[PDB]
Symmetry: C2
Subunit: 67 residues, 2 copies
């Protein structure tokens, strides 16, 4: 949302084991307003999965989503 | 609702009360969020944050979902 007073998604736990890469189609980082600096993997059924950018598998997943 | 799925949080409350007729539903943001909040879901599907302690917010929720 463009509205300051509207909700924004935040993460409070990171997924431990990597979700199948083929089931992920997009990603974005949660707002800097959130307490945790997470990445969100958007799945095939549009689930918003939180992950830790510092973890190697997460870093590679993000890179593999480059154009 | 896995612990690792995102959940909506509020960081600012709408100051001016939005048109009550524009509201179709409401819910409370997770206690995991830093701020307590009532979210009014509008007919445009916006998720508007409001302060639960405000009089209008209280009277709004007391008269919705009926």
């Amino acid at each position: 949302s463009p509205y300051s007073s509207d909700t924004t998604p935040c993460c409070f736990a990171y997924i431990a084991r990597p979700l199948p890469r083929a089931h992920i189609k997009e990603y974005f980082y949660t707002s800097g307003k959130c307490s945790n600096p997470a990445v969100v993997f958007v799945t095939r059924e549009n689930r918003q999965v939180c992950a830790n950018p510092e973890k190697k598998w997460v870093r590679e997943y993000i890179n593999s989503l480059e154009m």
